[PDB]
Symmetry: none
Subunit: 106 residues, 2 copies
């Protein structure tokens, strides 16, 4: 099953993507720049750290991307891949300008 993600506009300090949880449990998230390169904390991997960089908020139907995550994102466009306990992946695009971030669902 693939319940899934809304477009949104937010701030780097408490950015949340509205998310229809009902379905799945999140396993991990990758982040890469559009034109290649791992994005976010730990440049040596595309896969980010649960809790530190991102965390699902099942009660609130939100995916949080933390401020620590955005500290390691160069202004621009980033594609996120959310991996669930299979079912299956879900892409999402984020555009970061300074403190502003726009999120675009696939």
């Amino acid at each position: 099953r693939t319940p899934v993600l809304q477009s949104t506009q937010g701030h780097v300090s408490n950015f949340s993507i509205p998310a229809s949880f009902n379905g799945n449990s999140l396993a991990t998230m990758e982040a890469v720049y559009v034109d290649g390169g791992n994005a976010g904390p730990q440049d040596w991997t595309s896969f980010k750290e649960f809790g530190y960089a991102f965390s699902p908020s099942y009660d609130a139907n939100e995916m949080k991307l933390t401020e620590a995550f955005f500290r390691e994102v160069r202004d621009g466009e980033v594609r996120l891949t959310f991996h669930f306990w299979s079912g299956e992946t879900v892409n999402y695009t984020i555009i970061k300008n300074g403190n502003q971030v726009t999120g675009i669902a696939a």
Copy 2:
């Protein structure tokens, strides 16, 4: 022109969403002041709160989100919110915060 608008609700500070129609409008900003005076929410120096940080419209879901960060800077009690659209026109709403609980009352 037109004023589609807001429902009463009850929630927790972590989350809080006000049911909202959407249409007509697009939100421009939101003010928050205590009933007894004083700017409420993050940035005491202005009544006008920060779009995206303190609040955000959720057009697809017909909701106004007030974030947890907003509430962290609201002293327990009663706050009047004034939502300003592009433009048509303002809409008042009352929130009562008690600890982690919040009640929202429509105009």
